[PDB]
Design a protein around this ligand. Structure first.
Ligand SMILES: CCOc1ncccc1C(=O)N(C)C
Ligand SMILES: [Cl-]
Ligand SMILES: [Cl-]
Ligand SMILES: [Cl-]
Length: 163
């Protein structure tokens, strides 16, 4: 565990993280994909061997000794708001199980279902609150990665509000 488990946010490419493992915002088919998934494919392509897994689940594959946790959030273009909310919560619960099982002291995590799976809706708060619900009982240092300057501010505010 970390000595004083924390949440932090950084605005940069998650493929350049300084943590002991990474969460990929994966597709269910283990394809290279776009956005975070394509950056993860370029950095850790070995981790996409048998990485296909259903919506609402996470599957870990090692790149050398570095763990890549493939977490499959729902595409809100296809799911109802109700069913999508349930699957997005479940994907983060499976990430917390994997982080715990691996025994890492830190994890880099993107906000699932906030990009091309958002159905064009702002889901910062929805996705971040499911992240907190899952990860609050873990003792890893969590570092959230984003690309937008206004999102960095809003994620940082949400973290500081609870401290
Ligand atoms: C910066 C705002 O971003 C978005 N807003 C609404 C829907 C999707 C996005 C997006 O593609 N993100 C990568 C988060
Ligand atoms: Cl960068
Ligand atoms: Cl997405
Ligand atoms: Cl972002």
């Amino acid at each position: 565990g970390a000595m004083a488990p924390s949440y932090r946010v950084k605005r940069m490419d998650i493929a350049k993280n300084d943590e002991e493992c990474v969460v990929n915002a994966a597709n269910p088919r283990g394809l290279p994909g776009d956005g975070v998934c394509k950056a993860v494919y370029k950095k850790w392509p070995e981790s996409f061997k048998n990485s296909a897994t259903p919506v609402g689940t996470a599957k870990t594959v090692m790149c050398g000794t570095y763990p890549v946790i493939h977490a499959v959030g729902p595409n809100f273009s296809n799911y109802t708001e109700s069913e999508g909310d349930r699957e997005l919560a479940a994907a983060y619960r499976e990430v917390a199980k994997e982080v715990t099982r691996l025994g890492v002291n830190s994890v880099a995590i993107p906000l699932l279902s906030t990009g091309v799976y958002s159905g064009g809706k702002d889901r910062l708060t929805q996705s971040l609150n499911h992240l907190f619900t899952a990860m609050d009982s873990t003792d890893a240092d969590v570092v959230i990665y984003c690309r937008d300057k206004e999102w960095e501010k809003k994620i940082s505010e949400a973290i500081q509000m609870r401290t």
